[PDB]
Input
Amino acid sequence: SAVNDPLELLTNKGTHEPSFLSPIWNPIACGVAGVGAAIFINWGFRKPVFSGIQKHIAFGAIGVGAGAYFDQKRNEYLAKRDAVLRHYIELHPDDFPVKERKTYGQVLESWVPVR
Amino acid sequence: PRSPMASFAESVLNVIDGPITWFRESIVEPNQQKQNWYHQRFRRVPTIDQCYTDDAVCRFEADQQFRRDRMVDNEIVNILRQRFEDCTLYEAPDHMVKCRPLMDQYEKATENWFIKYGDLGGYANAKTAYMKQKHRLIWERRHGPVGSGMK
Amino acid sequence: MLKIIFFLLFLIPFCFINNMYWMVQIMMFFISFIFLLMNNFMNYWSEISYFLGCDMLSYGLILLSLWICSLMLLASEMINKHNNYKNLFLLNIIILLLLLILTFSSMSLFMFYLFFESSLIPTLFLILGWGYQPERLQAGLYLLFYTLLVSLPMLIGIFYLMNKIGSMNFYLMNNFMFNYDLLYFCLLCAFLVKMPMFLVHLWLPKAHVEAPVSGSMILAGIMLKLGGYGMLRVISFLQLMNLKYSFVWISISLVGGVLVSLVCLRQTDLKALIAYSSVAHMGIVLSGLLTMTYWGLCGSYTLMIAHGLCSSGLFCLANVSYERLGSRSMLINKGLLNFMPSMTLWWFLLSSANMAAPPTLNLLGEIYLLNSIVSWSWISMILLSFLSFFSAAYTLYLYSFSQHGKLFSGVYSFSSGKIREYLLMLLHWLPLNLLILKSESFMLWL
Amino acid sequence: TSLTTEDFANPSPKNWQSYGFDYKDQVEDRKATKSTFFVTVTLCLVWGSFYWAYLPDTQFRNWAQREGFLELRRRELAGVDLVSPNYVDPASITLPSDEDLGDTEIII
Amino acid sequence: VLGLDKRALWGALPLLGFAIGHFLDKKETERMTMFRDKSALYGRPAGSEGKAPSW
Amino acid sequence: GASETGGVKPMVIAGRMVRERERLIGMSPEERAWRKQWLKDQELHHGPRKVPALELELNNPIKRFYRAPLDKVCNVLEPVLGFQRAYTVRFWTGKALLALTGIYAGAYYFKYNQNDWTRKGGWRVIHSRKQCVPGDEGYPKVSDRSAPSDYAARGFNESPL
Output
């Protein structure tokens, strides 16, 4: 629409579809991190890197669990953040007034003649 | 074939032409299949002037349209150059009288080309080209056509 | 685009399995072939994936790296011959390549910077790890500290652009034109260093002379281009400011190119001379780039591709000679036509390309920068004539002096050229010519 | 040792000369040479250059030339300048009248 | 003529990365479907539209 | 191991006397004897032997077949004229055949695949007007191309669009 209402801009509509890697990147990233961290420990102790896979599974499992938990909390923090902005906009409609959208017909800015 | 060599010349041209025409007619053409290919058509899209200053898709729409039109306009000059190119070769030694109109068509096109896309350099885009026009027109009504100086 | 990235990532473990040095390049060459098939790019960005795209500009520079980074493995066969931490060496290049691919394939300015410098550290390990001479320290710091000193202030200039544009994406930036004088110096003095400019080139002769053969390839091959590539993206919204201070850069690079060519003639080291030849041509690239005209932009993109392949090529040959004669000085290296006559052919073709000889892709780009510069000002014809004249003066001196005369006297017996070396040289030069046929693609990025 | 006139004339298939790819295992050295040639040449240069040549018209440069002819014929017949000097028609534009400008710098 | 051995069998792992890399971005294009057949330059005529969307 | 030198232990045998100045200034009796011996060895009393190994080690399979047929006429004729004379016939019957097929492919290409208006690449021909002289057909001959569309048509006048 021709209007610039800041509250409209913030408000979601559900049109956006989050990417495929979005709901899995933090779990999978931590899971790989846990395993890789376990790989150092054996290497640091000059043990066969895949010896004692128990520790790999634990670190991988612990990584996934922690990743999912913190990812769950992340969205609440983001959801709350926009909620704050939307509420603050509503309280001060004067400081965020609706502005009209100019088009290039009604403006004359400079250009840079390279020559 | 009034000349001796020209009589020998045509003999060779029969030798090099004879097989290839047969080969074209015997193998290549008869064995091929029928198939048609078409020509892209682009629906005209809104110019940059209609675009708002905050939306990027509409600007992106026009920038690509401007660029495609630039190519068409870059080489419509190229075609006109090739005409004066070809007339000079097909009309010599008396080519000045005949190429002179063609070059007149060419030089006019270049100026219109240079009035539109000229002096923008690379990164020229719909916004810049349109804004050159706005500044050009303002100067025209105030100082008259360019080349006459200011008042 | 992710096809490339995940291919490289899963090739990382090949560094750990033993007797996999040669199986790596094939995976590195094969991916170039796969990447070579997916050319359907345009001026605008294409094949979006979460923040990774590619236009015609980024494509050629990416493909150049894959080719060059693949030749690094061929050139540095000595690392395999002496098992000199080859596994670690391989991991350095695979990491380094990934940083380059992301750097060019990044769609947002902040990312470009994020992987811009990050590629440096894999290079820095390369110099110290596998360099012979003791000076790799005193040349290791120059590469690191010239770059960091001028890249850290660039980081501020990047963030100041969010608060105005609101984003980093290149297309959205071009809609703006900025007027602040310092901001101009915080996004070009950082790239003018890495080009390099004549007066701030002091790191380039040190890094190249001391770095190993492979480090010389990538330093001369892709690092000098990241400065050039960066400029092509950020003069779009510095057009107005570029007009007030361009004449400073054009004069320095043009006069810088001439003066360095004389410096080339007074060199006596192969590695030094080739490195100083890089500053000479990079002066023309930068000069035409700042002219901002359609020709100067397309030409600059072309020459960066061509020059990288050549200067990378010429570093092969210096390594070949150095490997046997044991010394990189011109006095030691004489008359090599009478030891390795088959080699001398490749010396000529790569040397000839460096002096803008036809039909190389190098001459196509150089014709264009020359056009833009002349159009910029007819006064530029003076040195632009000198620079092109002297740009052959040292090239002949490089080729003729090292190949023609009577053989050195003290040299001890050494092996002759091997098939690996010849194959390496072909892959450097042969594309540099055939690319002229399809300059259609690697030229018209605008 | 003291090699003979036939140890130089009857090449021993025991020692070998390396092609620069390996110096320890003879079969390895030939093996790397063969595979490296195949990809670098038989695929990257032969198949690559072939595929390049038949690449589809992706820059719209061939397409333009078709326009440059059709577009030229239509407008050479239509009594319009062959290259339009206006990005948009001047009458469509709405100039800001002089009082609006208020000494804004105008450039050409 | 290839001169490839069992060691190249490890090559399947990088080829595994290729398919996984291909799959994701292909999955990404299926997330790009809000200007699909709607832009002014390629948008379908309003009414009597093709059943399957182009690309 | 891979011995580049093939066992034979590389050395320098000639010594001082290779350089002319180092000979004139002086040479001990042993050096003179050594120098005389060195030159006597450089003489070869036979031509190079023919090693079968090279001829396969420097001929790829494709080449050994790609040339196989015309080497049968070399084998057929080599007792009729001598190996030198016959081989020359094998070289010129073959290399010349490539030229004959070279022109025809070139002649073909310039007759059908010449550059047209629907492509940019390809060879583009703009020939001039032949000298029309008396006795030729219709002596008062004029260039049929008058309108600008005539020039640089590139086959565009006869397109369907």
